[PDB]
Amino acid sequence: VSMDDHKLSLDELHRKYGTDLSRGLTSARAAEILARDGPNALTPPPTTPEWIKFCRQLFGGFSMLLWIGAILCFLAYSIQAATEEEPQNDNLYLGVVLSAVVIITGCFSYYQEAKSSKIMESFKNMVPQQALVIRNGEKMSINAEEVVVGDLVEVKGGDRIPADLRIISANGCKVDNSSLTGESEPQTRSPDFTNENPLETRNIAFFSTNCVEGTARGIVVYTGDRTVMGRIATLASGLEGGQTPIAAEIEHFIHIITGVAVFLGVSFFILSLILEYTWLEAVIFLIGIIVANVPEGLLATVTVCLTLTAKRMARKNCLVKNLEAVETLGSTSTICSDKTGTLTQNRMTVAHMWFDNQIHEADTTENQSGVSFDKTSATWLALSRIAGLCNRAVFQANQENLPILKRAVAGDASESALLKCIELCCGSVKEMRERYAKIVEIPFNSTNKYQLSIHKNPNTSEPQHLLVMKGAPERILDRCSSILLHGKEQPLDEELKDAFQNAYLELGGLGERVLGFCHLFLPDEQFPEGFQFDTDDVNFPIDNLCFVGLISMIDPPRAAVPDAVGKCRSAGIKVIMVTGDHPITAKAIAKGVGIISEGNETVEDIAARLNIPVSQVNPRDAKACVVHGSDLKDMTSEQLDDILKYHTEIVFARTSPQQKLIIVEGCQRQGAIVAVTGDGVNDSPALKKADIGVAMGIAGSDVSKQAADMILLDDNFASIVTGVEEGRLIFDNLKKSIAYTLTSNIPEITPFLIFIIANIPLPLGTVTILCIDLGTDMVPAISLAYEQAESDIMKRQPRNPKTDKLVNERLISMAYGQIGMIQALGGFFTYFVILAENGFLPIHLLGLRVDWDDRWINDVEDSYGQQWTYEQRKIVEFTCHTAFFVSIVVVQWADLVICKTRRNSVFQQGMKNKILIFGLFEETALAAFLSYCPGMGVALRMYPLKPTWWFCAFPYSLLIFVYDKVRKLIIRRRPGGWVEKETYY
Amino acid sequence: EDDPFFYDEHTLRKRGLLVAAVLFITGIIILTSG
Amino acid sequence: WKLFIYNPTTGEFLGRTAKSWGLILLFYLVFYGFLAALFSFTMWVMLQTLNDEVPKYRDQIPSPGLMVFPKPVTALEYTFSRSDPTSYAGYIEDLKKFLKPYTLEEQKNLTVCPDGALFEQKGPVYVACQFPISLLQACSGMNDPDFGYSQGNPCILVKMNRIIGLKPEGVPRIDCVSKNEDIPNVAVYPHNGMIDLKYFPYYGKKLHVGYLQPLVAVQVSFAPNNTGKEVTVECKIDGSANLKSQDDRDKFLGRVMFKITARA
Ligand SMILES: CCCCCCCC/C=C/CCCCCCCC(=O)OC[C@H](COP(=O)(O)OCC[N+](C)(C)C)OC(=O)CCCCCCC/C=C/CCCCCCCC
Ligand SMILES: CCCCCCCC/C=C/CCCCCCCC(=O)OC[C@H](COP(=O)(O)OCC[N+](C)(C)C)OC(=O)CCCCCCC/C=C/CCCCCCCC
Ligand SMILES: CCCCCCCC/C=C\CCCCCCCC(=O)O[C@H](COC(=O)CCCCCCC/C=C/CCCCCCCC)COP(=O)(O)OCC[N+](C)(C)C
Ligand SMILES: Nc1ncnc2c1ncn2[C@@H]1O[C@H](COP(=O)(O)OP(=O)(O)CP(=O)(O)O)[C@@H](O)[C@H]1O
Ligand SMILES: CC(C)CCC[C@@H](C)[C@H]1CC[C@H]2[C@@H]3CC=C4C[C@@H](O)CC[C@]4(C)[C@H]3CC[C@]12C
Ligand SMILES: CC(C)CCC[C@@H](C)[C@H]1CC[C@H]2[C@@H]3CC=C4C[C@@H](O)CC[C@]4(C)[C@H]3CC[C@]12C
Ligand code: NA
Ligand code: NA
């Protein structure tokens, strides 16, 4: 199905749709079509039902391994019951426990993911897609839903195309059709019909695409699923296979730990089979070892962290497309920010005017008129004419009732400020543009930095060709050969240029954007009344104009910017300002917001201070630099790296969209994670190139928001600091949880090794091995994801991805060599106490394994002479197993308490985490219940502990706390020392 | 006159269950703190 | 792993072997030495509280369980051949080793006590009554070096496990009944089971020096007409209310079962 209006002529368009090509349909017609044809929204496809995701949670991660373990336990119980009489129910009560644990963990993870997904979804509909449509001859910004078939819309740079529209008048318009064609090369658009194929023609846009630059009026021809995208079943929002670094680290750790655990389990299975075990017991032992040596519930901690971050970002108005991309935001080491719209409020008020070789203070003052300055000579009239003709900004529909300053303008900030000022002094810009026929207009772009227009002169002495131009004063003055003073055209000598430079220094030095203006009367001999102007041809005299003056408008820095910049520069993040404005204005703004501090001088600043030329000054004497954009063109890759690594305070002025990409790639080459804050279409590739891209929720275009990984819904620069802090907190909590989880592996594998080596009775059994792991390592480890941020979370340098990893050689060393060893010693001490208080002294246990485990030697002798039956001494052995589990609980109290923080005191951290205290209380309650519940001896072989057998692990639980406290005190006292080098994980 | 070969295991497990109940109640109360 | 253990450059064998490895090895040596010292001190403090003569808790070993001697190779199953002296040599050697202290010359120091009365002791002397080996008639090595083996009448000693301070009530007795339809005759030799009360209580290995516990010798008589066969015998304590012998979880508490298989 391929039917369109691409080959249809313009004459039938008015007849077919019943809408004017210029004025368009009225509000009543738009409402009728909307009520008839419906809204402009694709039908949301239901991807997966709720039961699909719940099963994915149930059978994801180590939960499948636990399902396998439970199934094998049930099979072992079935075989045992079928073979023997009076079978043991250990396998049944173990399989039930494993299945219940899997179900509970899956339900919890599903609930957390549902919360996170709902919170993330609540932001997709928050941002309304705004489209500019000409209705009743006036342009209005409406939602994309209300766009109907028939009306004409305006598409410009960075504006997402609302619907399938037929271009009727495009200038400089290039569209990006990577969604359909696949190539990112822009394609030009012209009203004329070129290609027969509907897709290959150049006079229609096929929706879901964007215009990189230029502007185009086009009639919307299709709406909703009737467009090309709606016909095909391909998913428009196709997620790419992008893996975040934190996810890669987690996956690598999971793979390594699973391999290690499987190796240990297989080795222990073989060793137990060598020690005359039984198959139905050896397989259960292997399952216990494998399950206890893998960190199940690690993914639940990650899910809780993501949900907490999603909750926190929602209160700061920070849309995040991928919640796992906040770790990179916390790992950010460089921030490249734009001056206008990010570090400034983007509210421009005209402040000063330089003309007639004089600076005039301009104040709006809707009432009481100007302060001291007046109409002056005809130079002001010429400047007002230039500003009126050059501007393409107009007020919104039905807005000519309120005062001009409060009125809304649908143009750029500078254009809006100029329009308001010229309507305050002069008036009726609509009639002014009616007076002068704007035959030719060159759209403004950052590549040229000037705006040009051609008008027909209606004066008595009319050359019929007036060329008006505005733009950057240094670029503008480079071509305006003459100057207009006192209304008389005069040559531009060196003195006037020096005066202009002094005026630029005075106006720009206060932190104001300055625009220079020129008008030229084209000769009639070279150009008759009828001339065919073309962009490709030179035609009009682009050079040799007449200068008039400069208009300087203020733009105060945003209120929250200075504190955010201070926090970033105190946290170790280098803030670079990349702007297209003059170095004077950029440097003044940077000093205002705190990017360039007080006491740091530029090379030019040092030269001026010492009254010496710019040369002969050693560049290393200056830690702050303001690199001009034109100088960056001739810089080398090595030369740029010297700039980016020797200067703490770097500003880039008069840059271009490509040079921002060059700066970003250089910063990324210099081993830095770059966060680029861009809003316009001139930041689209830089946002994609940066490690973390930040757009603006209001000032940002519709392409910057689509290319960025984060959106500031209130444009607040004080949200980047919050994002960085939360990114650091995620990593801290994850590594704390991993460190706590890894401590319990040694106490669960050392008893079997000591059993084999010393031939003592078994200190710990499979049921107690799985009780240590499922009781103390899941809830307390999930409770560490709720831990608050440190006191100095934002006072530490950004983590080096290579030097500092999620799991390093110092986390493994600590967990497996100090805390795990202390816990194993505590468990062994409790086991020895229990066995010695019954008769078997510690030295009598060396070599008792063979006789202790023999079912037919029912006379095993004490150290006191008594003789024990097999079924009598196994009761004592299982009491020892229970005490080992209970002492691991006690020694893991003061391991969770010390993993609660990484470098600060626990007293300073506090007790805000209610989940951690809940986990401690519930694990000790579970231990007490397992020990003292009637019927546990028959079922799980758990026997009551005497009251004094609980305090055996107390001296070893205090040792962990004291050791950690002293080592963290040493770390703070001597930063960078041996302890922090080797012990700080 | 005390007698060996016998321990008051009924009272021991009764008090252990009471302590487990107290710990469970306290952990629930702390979690849902108003 | 390229350049995994390369010696040149500042980085040799991952961490610097000259300094980093030495420092970390010293740190872990000191750490584990302190941990071992703390564990040893804690164990010493625990062992100081205990008594060297009687265990702190005796509630996990409340009642004795019988056990047969010698211990066979495979699970209380005595297999021997009359014409093969190497089959029952282990049983004979074990019985001779066990019954060496019970010989008359070995127990000449032990005192003689009246029968039927519980021998309670208070003073630190803690004498031990002597158990004459003549009670186990025809099941001792004094008459024939083989303890009834090589004639088809093997002798097995059934002895009660020792518990410190246990005072049995009534008159204990071990009665062995053949579960093989009583085709052979099981003869508990000290008349009945007849476990005399003068050998109780037991006061510990340290206090009670030279203590010899009562023994019961059973002699399954394999008749010449039926050569071979398998005889299942169960001996339990029957006369004392103190000594429980009806627990189902523990199949050796107060009772014992065994099988004798003859050949040729
Ligand atoms: C910052 C420090 C980090 C480093 C920590 C290092 C470790 C040292 C810290 C210790 C603080 C926690 C202490 C926990 C004590 C164990 C708790 C427990 O699980 O002990 C269970 C046992 C069971 O013995 P049983 O009953 O079977 O013996 C009765 C038999 N009879 C008659 C024969 C003798 O009990 C006992 O041994 C003790 C007897 C008392 C048990 C009841 C009291 C416990 C209940 C507390 C809840 C109170 C509410 C608290 C709310 C505010 C919290 C801030
Ligand atoms: C986690 C991996 C390692 C796991 C280790 C498992 C535990 C160690 C296992 C040991 C097996 C043998 C233990 C028994 C040794 C003989 C004990 C002994 O004969 O006790 C006697 C002495 C003194 O008694 P007394 O005369 O005062 O009693 C008189 C009082 N009355 C009369 C009342 C009794 O008691 C004493 O000295 C104190 C007892 C000495 C115990 C030494 C334990 C050494 C363990 C070191 C582990 C440290 C970390 C190791 C790292 C390994 C990887 C590199
Ligand atoms: C501060 C840092 C720098 C210093 C650190 C080093 C000092 C602290 C370390 C160890 C000292 C405390 C442990 C002393 C135990 C004496 C037990 C004894 O001596 O038992 C002796 C015999 O053992 C044994 O048969 C068992 C031997 C194996 C078990 C004990 C092993 C002890 C080895 C421990 C080294 C562990 C090292 C771990 C870390 C490795 C890196 C350093 C004496 O028994 P007996 O002849 O009376 O038995 C008579 C028996 N019947 C009465 C039946 C005739
Ligand atoms: N409507 C307009 N017509 C002509 N020139 C304009 C203009 N708006 C701005 N300019 C000038 O063009 C120059 C190029 O600025 P550009 O548009 O590339 O960056 P920018 O200032 O708009 C955003 P930022 O300041 O955050 O980098 C500016 O110095 C400005 O003075
Ligand atoms: C005695 C048996 C049963 C268990 C003893 C385990 C001990 C010897 C093992 C387990 C964990 C191990 C540590 C794990 C990790 C590292 C980090 C590495 O950079 C140096 C070695 C070091 C520090 C290991 C030393 C040896 C170690 C402490
Ligand atoms: C380093 C410092 C803290 C060590 C000093 C504490 C030592 C001496 C304390 C702490 C824990 C104590 C033990 C706790 C429990 C028991 C079980 C009980 O039935 C007999 C006493 C015994 C065995 C205690 C002996 C003394 C003990 C080992
Ligand atoms: Na685990
Ligand atoms: Na574990």
Coordinates of N, CA and C in Angstrom, one line a residue, chain A residues 31-121:
Chain A
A31 N -11.2 22.0 15.1 CA -11.9 21.3 16.1 C -12.8 20.2 15.5
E32 N -13.5 20.5 14.4 CA -14.3 19.5 13.7 C -13.5 18.3 13.2
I33 N -12.4 18.6 12.6 CA -11.5 17.5 12.2 C -11.0 16.7 13.3
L34 N -10.6 17.3 14.4 CA -10.1 16.6 15.6 C -11.2 15.7 16.2
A35 N -12.5 16.2 16.3 CA -13.6 15.4 16.8 C -14.0 14.3 15.8
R36 N -13.6 14.5 14.5 CA -14.0 13.5 13.5 C -12.8 12.5 13.3
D37 N -11.6 13.0 13.0 CA -10.5 12.1 12.7 C -9.8 11.6 13.9
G38 N -10.0 12.2 15.1 CA -9.4 11.7 16.3 C -8.0 12.3 16.5
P39 N -7.4 11.9 17.6 CA -6.1 12.5 17.9 C -4.9 11.9 17.1
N40 N -3.8 12.6 17.1 CA -2.6 12.2 16.4 C -1.7 11.4 17.4
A41 N -2.1 10.2 17.7 CA -1.3 9.3 18.5 C -1.4 7.9 18.0
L42 N -0.2 7.2 17.9 CA -0.2 5.8 17.6 C -0.7 5.0 18.7
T43 N -1.4 3.9 18.4 CA -2.0 3.0 19.4 C -0.9 2.3 20.2
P44 N -0.9 2.5 21.5 CA 0.2 1.8 22.3 C 0.1 0.3 22.2
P45 N 1.2 -0.3 21.7 CA 1.1 -1.8 21.6 C 1.4 -2.4 23.0
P46 N 0.6 -3.4 23.4 CA 0.9 -4.1 24.7 C 2.1 -5.1 24.4
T47 N 3.2 -4.8 25.0 CA 4.4 -5.6 24.7 C 4.3 -7.0 25.4
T48 N 4.2 -7.0 26.7 CA 4.1 -8.3 27.4 C 3.1 -8.1 28.6
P49 N 2.3 -9.1 28.9 CA 1.4 -9.0 30.1 C 2.1 -9.1 31.4
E50 N 1.4 -9.0 32.5 CA 2.1 -9.1 33.8 C 2.7 -10.4 34.1
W51 N 2.0 -11.5 33.7 CA 2.5 -12.8 34.0 C 3.8 -13.2 33.3
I52 N 4.1 -12.5 32.2 CA 5.3 -12.7 31.5 C 6.5 -12.2 32.3
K53 N 6.4 -11.0 32.8 CA 7.5 -10.4 33.6 C 7.6 -11.1 34.9
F54 N 6.5 -11.5 35.6 CA 6.6 -12.2 36.8 C 7.4 -13.6 36.7
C55 N 7.1 -14.3 35.6 CA 7.8 -15.5 35.4 C 9.3 -15.3 35.1
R56 N 9.6 -14.1 34.4 CA 10.9 -13.8 34.1 C 11.7 -13.5 35.4
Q57 N 11.1 -12.8 36.4 CA 11.7 -12.6 37.7 C 11.9 -13.9 38.4
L58 N 10.9 -14.8 38.3 CA 11.0 -16.1 39.0 C 12.1 -17.0 38.5
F59 N 12.3 -17.0 37.2 CA 13.3 -17.8 36.5 C 14.5 -17.0 36.0
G60 N 14.9 -16.0 36.7 CA 16.0 -15.2 36.3 C 17.1 -15.2 37.4
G61 N 18.3 -15.1 36.9 CA 19.5 -15.1 37.8 C 19.7 -16.5 38.5
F62 N 20.2 -16.4 39.7 CA 20.4 -17.7 40.5 C 19.1 -18.4 40.9
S63 N 18.0 -17.7 40.7 CA 16.7 -18.4 41.0 C 16.5 -19.7 40.3
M64 N 17.0 -19.8 39.1 CA 16.9 -21.0 38.3 C 17.8 -22.1 39.0
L65 N 19.0 -21.7 39.5 CA 19.8 -22.6 40.2 C 19.1 -23.1 41.5
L66 N 18.4 -22.2 42.2 CA 17.7 -22.6 43.4 C 16.5 -23.5 43.0
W67 N 15.8 -23.3 41.9 CA 14.8 -24.2 41.4 C 15.4 -25.6 41.2
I68 N 16.5 -25.6 40.5 CA 17.2 -26.9 40.3 C 17.5 -27.6 41.6
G69 N 18.0 -26.9 42.6 CA 18.3 -27.4 43.9 C 17.1 -28.0 44.6
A70 N 16.0 -27.2 44.5 CA 14.7 -27.7 45.2 C 14.2 -29.0 44.5
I71 N 14.3 -29.0 43.1 CA 13.8 -30.2 42.4 C 14.7 -31.4 42.7
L72 N 16.0 -31.2 42.8 CA 16.8 -32.3 43.2 C 16.6 -32.7 44.6
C73 N 16.3 -31.8 45.5 CA 15.9 -32.2 46.9 C 14.7 -33.0 46.9
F74 N 13.7 -32.6 46.2 CA 12.4 -33.4 46.1 C 12.7 -34.8 45.5
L75 N 13.5 -34.9 44.5 CA 13.9 -36.2 43.9 C 14.6 -37.0 44.9
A76 N 15.6 -36.5 45.6 CA 16.3 -37.2 46.6 C 15.3 -37.8 47.7
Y77 N 14.4 -36.9 48.2 CA 13.4 -37.4 49.1 C 12.6 -38.5 48.6
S78 N 12.1 -38.4 47.3 CA 11.3 -39.4 46.7 C 12.1 -40.8 46.6
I79 N 13.4 -40.7 46.2 CA 14.2 -41.9 46.1 C 14.4 -42.5 47.5
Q80 N 14.7 -41.7 48.5 CA 14.9 -42.2 49.8 C 13.7 -42.8 50.4
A81 N 12.5 -42.2 50.2 CA 11.3 -42.8 50.7 C 10.9 -44.1 49.9
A82 N 11.2 -44.2 48.6 CA 10.9 -45.4 47.9 C 11.9 -46.5 48.3
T83 N 13.1 -46.2 48.6 CA 14.1 -47.2 48.9 C 14.0 -47.7 50.4
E84 N 14.2 -46.8 51.3 CA 14.4 -47.1 52.7 C 13.0 -47.0 53.5
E85 N 13.0 -47.4 54.7 CA 12.0 -47.3 55.7 C 12.3 -46.2 56.7
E86 N 11.3 -45.5 57.1 CA 11.5 -44.3 58.0 C 12.5 -43.3 57.4
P87 N 12.1 -42.7 56.3 CA 13.0 -41.7 55.6 C 13.1 -40.4 56.3
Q88 N 14.2 -39.7 56.1 CA 14.4 -38.4 56.6 C 13.6 -37.3 55.8
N89 N 13.0 -36.3 56.5 CA 12.3 -35.3 55.8 C 13.2 -34.0 55.6
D90 N 14.5 -34.1 55.8 CA 15.4 -33.0 55.6 C 15.3 -32.5 54.1
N91 N 15.3 -33.5 53.2 CA 15.2 -33.1 51.8 C 13.9 -32.4 51.5
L92 N 12.8 -32.9 52.0 CA 11.5 -32.3 51.8 C 11.4 -30.9 52.3
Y93 N 11.8 -30.7 53.6 CA 11.8 -29.4 54.2 C 12.8 -28.4 53.7
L94 N 13.8 -29.0 52.9 CA 14.8 -28.1 52.3 C 14.3 -27.7 50.9
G95 N 13.7 -28.6 50.1 CA 13.1 -28.2 48.9 C 12.0 -27.2 49.0
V96 N 11.1 -27.4 50.0 CA 10.0 -26.5 50.3 C 10.6 -25.1 50.6
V97 N 11.6 -25.0 51.4 CA 12.3 -23.8 51.8 C 12.9 -23.1 50.6
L98 N 13.6 -23.8 49.8 CA 14.2 -23.2 48.6 C 13.1 -22.7 47.6
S99 N 12.1 -23.4 47.4 CA 11.0 -22.9 46.5 C 10.3 -21.7 47.1
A100 N 10.1 -21.7 48.4 CA 9.4 -20.5 49.0 C 10.3 -19.3 48.9
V101 N 11.6 -19.5 49.1 CA 12.6 -18.4 49.1 C 12.6 -17.8 47.6
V102 N 12.6 -18.7 46.6 CA 12.6 -18.2 45.3 C 11.4 -17.4 45.0
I103 N 10.2 -18.0 45.4 CA 9.0 -17.3 45.1 C 8.9 -15.9 45.8
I104 N 9.4 -15.8 47.1 CA 9.3 -14.6 47.8 C 10.3 -13.6 47.2
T105 N 11.5 -14.0 46.8 CA 12.4 -13.1 46.2 C 11.9 -12.6 44.8
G106 N 11.3 -13.5 44.0 CA 10.8 -13.1 42.8 C 9.6 -12.1 42.9
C107 N 8.7 -12.3 43.9 CA 7.7 -11.4 44.1 C 8.2 -10.0 44.6
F108 N 9.2 -10.0 45.4 CA 9.7 -8.7 45.9 C 10.4 -8.0 44.7
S109 N 11.2 -8.7 43.9 CA 11.8 -8.1 42.7 C 10.8 -7.6 41.7
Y110 N 9.7 -8.4 41.5 CA 8.6 -7.9 40.6 C 7.9 -6.7 41.2
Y111 N 7.7 -6.6 42.5 CA 7.1 -5.4 43.0 C 8.0 -4.2 42.9
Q112 N 9.2 -4.3 43.2 CA 10.2 -3.2 43.0 C 10.3 -2.8 41.6
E113 N 10.3 -3.7 40.6 CA 10.4 -3.4 39.2 C 9.1 -2.7 38.7
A114 N 8.0 -3.2 39.3 CA 6.7 -2.5 38.9 C 6.7 -1.1 39.4
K115 N 7.1 -0.8 40.6 CA 7.2 0.5 41.1 C 8.1 1.4 40.2
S116 N 9.3 0.9 39.9 CA 10.3 1.6 39.1 C 9.7 1.9 37.7
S117 N 9.1 0.9 37.1 CA 8.6 1.1 35.7 C 7.4 2.1 35.7
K118 N 6.6 2.0 36.7 CA 5.5 3.0 36.8 C 6.0 4.4 37.0
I119 N 7.0 4.6 37.8 CA 7.6 5.9 38.1 C 8.2 6.4 36.8
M120 N 9.0 5.6 36.1 CA 9.6 6.0 34.8 C 8.6 6.3 33.8
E121 N 7.5 5.5 33.7 CA 6.4 5.8 32.7 C 5.7 7.1 33.0

